[PDB]
Amino acid sequence: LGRKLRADTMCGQNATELFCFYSENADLTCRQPKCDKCNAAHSHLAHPPSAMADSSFRFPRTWWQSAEDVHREKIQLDLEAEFYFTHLIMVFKSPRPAAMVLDRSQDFGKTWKPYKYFATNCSATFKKGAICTSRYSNPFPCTVIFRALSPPYDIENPYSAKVQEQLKITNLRVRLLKRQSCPCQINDLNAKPHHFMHYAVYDFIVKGSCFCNGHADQCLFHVVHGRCMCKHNTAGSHCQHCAPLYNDRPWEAADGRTGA
Amino acid sequence: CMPEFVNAAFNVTVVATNTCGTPPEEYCVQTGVTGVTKSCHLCDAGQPHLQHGAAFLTDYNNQADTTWWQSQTMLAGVQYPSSINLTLHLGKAFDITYVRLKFHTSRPESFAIYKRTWEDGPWIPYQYYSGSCENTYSKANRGFIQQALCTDEFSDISPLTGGNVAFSTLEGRPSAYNFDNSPVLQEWVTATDISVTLNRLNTFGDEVFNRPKVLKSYYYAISDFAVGGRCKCNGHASECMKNEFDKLVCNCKHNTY
């Protein structure tokens, strides 16, 4: 959000092929394709990946999809510092496939793991409360909801390093395997349409509080930085240590319940 | 003779305990709908047109743009076991078959719905709608089995703009398809006074940060009560012809009203 999200090439670059949106009406019925042209000439005809992650102050919304009918499409989200996340969100205008995986990176893109992934057949990605759960993903309609914090994690949640690793991130990626475009009245005219490849994705904004260890009131379009002037005489970007004036007293992270 | 279903939010006012505008407030919301240059503007009620009043919520519900209302934000410290409970005093026991609460800002993570069995009486909630109800509500997630169970299909802020909620009274429940032959469900669906219980929004610990904007953002906004219903009087009237005293009561046979 509010920053660059590097990825593969945009649409139509290696093939000057027509693309169209098979959007759907409120009656769960597809509408006639709103055929346009994808290129790299003008902003209207040139829509790099940055369109999703940029100041969206205009009524028209920024569209995006894969590079060129490629299944293994990934999104790179570089960071200039440490970040924090609240929960998991998923908006996907195209039909949401069961082969959805949510992954978290620890530091400088040097770690990888299947953080969370849920679907009716979670085997598609390759306790049943975090590894994967059923009845959460469906092929249709075209146009997954989960929360990172565990049920016992909602209460008694100080801000020490013991929980930072859970919600401290360095880069973002996501993988989708299954390919499908939700059904339409493709027999709109006598001649069938063509070059309908698309993965309608609305936008991605995973709000992340300015990481200040729950101490700072203000941390250095305008975007959120990673430098905090934490109060309680605390120093450091992460504010994990206090000033030596009275540090001798044992302490842990100032939990929001009382700010010890 | 056939009963005719009409929007139950027509020519009616929601009795809202708290509503924006009375004090001076400055709030900011996602740029999905407002589209302001900086996505920041000040809520008010003095302006005749910008009133977020009760009537705006229950109106014709213009599809192109329906008048929206915002509840008081976290600035008022509205996060308790009980919170703003805006109620509906329609005037008849409408059989609300389909309920849709189009949210102007976003779907709140934690919230519920409370319905009135009889006028001035207690509240009988239909169902709970939260993705972590095991904490806030202390109940099992993914409600299934008649009770006011939780719901997690659409709980978190997925849409982030113009959120949609399908409060299908007659669907999504074990008794969905036995509506016409379920005595409890017949009593369930009928609600003398509708009231969405926005009991609490489960904070994500951002309060310690105490950013002025974020607190003004984690609030509630019901764009419109897209709720439909009718007099359940065996449709002695295709439309409750109001009586002399300027209210809504039903037509009837056997020398009754």
Side-chain angles (χ1 to χ4, degrees):
Chain A
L1 62 90
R3 53 194 92 90
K4 299 171 199 74
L5 280 69
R6 304 312 315 276
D8 306 329
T9 183
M10 67 294 307
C11 55
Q13 295 313 293
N14 198 1
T16 313
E17 61 183 0
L18 279 60
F19 83 94
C20 311
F21 291 169
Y22 286 69
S23 163
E24 210 185 31
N25 297 353
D27 304 331
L28 271 293
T29 187
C30 166
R31 41 165 75 79
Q32 193 73 346
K34 313 303 178 264
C35 290
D36 302 331
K37 188 44 199 162
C38 180
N39 217 52
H42 275 281
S43 194
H44 44 256
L45 279 168
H47 292 233
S50 315
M52 321 205 88
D54 197 357
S55 48
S56 57
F57 297 148
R58 295 300 218 187
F59 280 82
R61 190 265 300 165
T62 46
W63 59 261
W64 192 229
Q65 74 103 30
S66 198
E68 294 301 341
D69 199 341
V70 63
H71 294 89
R72 50 167 300 166
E73 181 47 82
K74 199 137 72 69
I75 181 62
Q76 295 178 357
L77 190 154
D78 74 327
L79 274 67
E80 281 185 37
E82 179 55 66
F83 213 66
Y84 198 102
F85 293 60
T86 69
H87 41 86
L88 315 170
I89 49 157
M90 181 36 48
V91 68
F92 189 71
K93 263 184 79 201
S94 285
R96 58 209 173 285
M100 61 79 71
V101 177
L102 279 286
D103 311 284
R104 304 295 95 71
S105 47
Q106 202 64 21
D107 166 58
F108 308 148
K110 307 186 293 210
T111 311
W112 161 260
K113 65 182 181 180
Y115 182 76
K116 258 92 184 175
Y117 64 100
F118 317 92
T120 305
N121 199 281
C122 75
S123 78
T125 63
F126 313 97
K127 164 163 155 288
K128 207 76 175 184
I131 186 69
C132 77
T133 61
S134 70
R135 205 197 71 75
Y136 277 105
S137 310
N138 318 115
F140 316 122
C142 49
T143 314
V144 176
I145 298 194
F146 277 83
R147 287 155 188 196
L149 75 166
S150 304
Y153 289 13
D154 209 18
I155 307 174
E156 281 101 4
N157 52 347
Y159 314 141
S160 283
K162 79 196 182 63
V163 184
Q164 280 171 358
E165 65 89 19
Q166 202 194 359
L167 292 173
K168 84 193 212 173
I169 301 299
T170 186
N171 277 330
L172 275 298
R173 284 86 170 94
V174 66
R175 54 169 181 163
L176 277 296
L177 183 135
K178 244 182 177 170
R179 167 165 103 73
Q180 53 249 33
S181 56
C182 64
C184 182
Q185 69 275 17
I186 308 104
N187 297 320
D188 59 349
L189 320 179
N190 53 13
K192 299 273 278 188
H194 66 86
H195 294 146
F196 73 97
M197 73 292 291
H198 63 283
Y199 279 160
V201 54
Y202 182 76
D203 207 332
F204 263 59
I205 297 292
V206 180
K207 58 182 146 49
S209 54
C210 201
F211 183 84
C212 302
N213 199 354
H215 292 64
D217 172 37
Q218 172 264 321
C219 65
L220 293 155
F221 186 73
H222 317 272
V223 289
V224 192
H225 288 100
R227 330 296 183 278
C228 308
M229 293 177 227
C230 296
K231 67 159 141 187
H232 305 141
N233 209 357
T234 43
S237 159
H238 299 329
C239 312
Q240 203 67 18
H241 62 57
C242 72
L245 187 64
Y246 211 62
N247 81 322
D248 53 352
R249 76 180 170 104
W251 63 284
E252 63 89 6
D255 49 0
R257 304 289 168 289
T258 61
Chain B
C1 301
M2 42 165 188
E4 289 204 60
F5 297 78
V6 193
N7 308 72
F10 278 2
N11 283 92
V12 67
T13 183
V14 303
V15 177
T17 67
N18 212 335
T19 53
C20 184
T22 44
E25 324 186 359
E26 181 165 84
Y27 84 113
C28 305
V29 72
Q30 292 86 18
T31 178
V33 298
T34 63
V36 191
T37 187
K38 56 163 166 86
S39 71
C40 280
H41 55 278
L42 77 171
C43 179
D44 272 327
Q47 207 274 334
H49 206 145
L50 294 174
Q51 275 161 318
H52 313 67
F56 300 96
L57 278 156
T58 58
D59 70 315
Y60 168 55
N61 179 28
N62 170 24
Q63 308 314 131
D65 52 353
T66 181
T67 63
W68 61 88
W69 154 74
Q70 301 149 32
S71 184
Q72 277 303 81
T73 80
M74 279 278 183
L75 188 153
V78 192
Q79 46 100 30
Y80 283 43
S82 303
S83 291
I84 297 160
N85 296 115
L86 79 174
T87 71
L88 280 292
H89 285 67
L90 272 73
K92 196 50 170 75
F94 267 32
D95 270 6
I96 314 304
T97 298
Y98 43 100
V99 174
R100 180 155 51 72
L101 281 293
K102 184 74 74 67
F103 284 78
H104 170 87
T105 288
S106 63
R107 304 205 286 268
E109 44 263 34
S110 174
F111 73 118
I113 44 173
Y114 274 46
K115 313 305 210 298
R116 185 158 252 177
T117 316
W118 60 88
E119 311 66 20
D120 281 326
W123 301 96
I124 61 170
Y126 283 171
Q127 294 296 330
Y128 295 135
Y129 298 80
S130 170
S132 303
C133 78
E134 73 293 339
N135 180 13
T136 296
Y137 304 71
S138 310
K139 294 195 179 299
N141 200 357
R142 289 202 287 180
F144 81 101
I145 180 59
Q146 69 276 17
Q147 294 221 49
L149 286 181
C150 318
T151 300
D152 50 350
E153 285 294 272
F154 63 93
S155 59
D156 191 359
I157 44 159
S158 77
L160 294 174
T161 176
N164 289 10
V165 308
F167 283 29
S168 81
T169 47
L170 271 69
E171 284 303 294
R173 315 288 186 277
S175 183
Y177 311 126
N178 70 341
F179 158 88
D180 217 342
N181 299 309
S182 176
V184 177
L185 187 64
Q186 294 297 289
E187 191 265 325
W188 184 70
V189 64
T190 191
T192 55
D193 291 331
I194 299 314
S195 69
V196 188
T197 289
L198 298 76
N199 55 2
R200 190 194 264 183
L201 202 67
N202 282 124
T203 183
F204 311 135
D206 297 342
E207 313 326 310
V208 296
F209 293 99
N210 197 345
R211 274 41 200 181
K213 302 291 187 185
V214 69
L215 201 74
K216 288 305 313 185
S217 66
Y218 268 90
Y219 66 94
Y220 302 101
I222 314 309
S223 70
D224 184 76
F225 293 80
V227 58
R230 35 153 195 177
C231 314
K232 170 38 207 79
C233 268
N234 207 352
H236 266 108
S238 179
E239 154 71 62
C240 261
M241 163 42 184
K242 57 172 58 167
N243 50 9
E244 166 49 49
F245 285 129
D246 313 332
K247 281 170 270 288
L248 276 296
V249 316
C250 51
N251 301 13
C252 189
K253 66 198 163 217
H254 199 302
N255 220 310
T256 47
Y257 63 103

